[PDB]
Amino acid sequence: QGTILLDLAPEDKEYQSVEEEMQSTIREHRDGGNAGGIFNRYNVIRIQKVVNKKLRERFCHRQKEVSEENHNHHNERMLFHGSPFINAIIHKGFDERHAYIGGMFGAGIYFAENSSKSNQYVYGIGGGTGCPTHKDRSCYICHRQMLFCRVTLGKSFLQFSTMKMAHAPPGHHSVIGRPSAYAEYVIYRGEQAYPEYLITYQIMKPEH
Ligand SMILES: COc1ccc(Cl)cc1NCC(=O)N[C@H]1CC[C@H](n2c(=O)[nH]c3ccccc32)CC1
Ligand SMILES: [Zn+2]
Incomplete structure (x- = not known):
């Protein structure tokens, strides 16, 4: 009924495909490290696959609808998401009703x-x-x-x-803002995103 969290073995090509994509999309933010910390590599502690039937179904129904509306192209893309509600999201899915009106590009x-x-x-x-x-x-x-x-x-x-x-x-079905820089993908419907992988990690102090 709920969500099943499946651990992925580090030697599984699937674990490796996700960590590789996490480590390699690290970039300098003209931040000084203020927001996320100072580092240039993570210590990926664990990668779990989030399995929940109802979420998959709601997500696949919506993906069909979007195809119909966009010349049979749902344009699925693998993307990262960070926020303080990750535990809530993995059990109940993404929810726009908890979305913040004020956001740079809206309640998404x-x-x-x-x-x-x-x-x-x-x-x-x-x-x-x-x-x-x-x-x-x-x-x-x-x-x-x-x-x-x-x-x-x-x-x-x-x-x-x-x-x-x-x-x-x-x-349209999404918004992409290029903030100052980098890109922000925004959706306004919880069912357009499925939280596939839950990643537990640590940022690592710069080597000396
Ligand atoms: C709500 O506004 C924010 C608060 C903190 C951060 Cl760090 C980012 C945002 N907006 C960007 C953003 O993507 N926020 C999402 C975060 C998860 C939120 N969420 C969800 O999808 N399901 C939820 C269930 C309970 C509580 C929050 C939930 C919706 C809005
Ligand atoms: Zn701490």
Whole structure:
């Protein structure tokens, strides 16, 4: 009924395909390391596959609808997502009703193709006050989690200066803003994203 969390063996080509994609999409943010911490590699502690029947079905029904609307192209893309509700999301799925009106591009769910970008969001906007135990945004101790999800983009609307919209523009199914820089993929329907992989990891202090 609920969600089954499956561990992936590090020697499974599937584990390797996800960690490789997480480690390789690390980038410099002209941050100084403030939001997500100072690092240039993660210690991937665990990769779990999130299996939930109802979520898959809601997600596949919507993906069909979007195909119909976009010349049989649902445009599925694997994307990272970071935020403080990861546990809630893996059990009940993505939910736009918990989406923040004020967001740069509206009340949607945000995704990035760069792992170092979603890591900045693990403990809230800008990385809030860091980890709960150490009030440190660059904690090398506490374990963090992020999601690598299948995101049904359908036809993406390229917006390029803020517009706080509540739904994708007419005829589109997603929004891509290029903030200052990097890209933000936004959806306004929980069922357009499926949280495929749950990743437990730590940022690692720079070597010396
Ligand atoms: C709500 O506004 C935010 C608060 C903190 C961060 Cl770090 C990012 C955002 N907006 C971007 C974004 O993508 N936020 C998502 C985060 C998960 C949220 N979420 C969900 O999809 N299912 C949920 C179930 C319970 C609580 C939150 C949930 C919806 C909005
Ligand atoms: Zn900590």
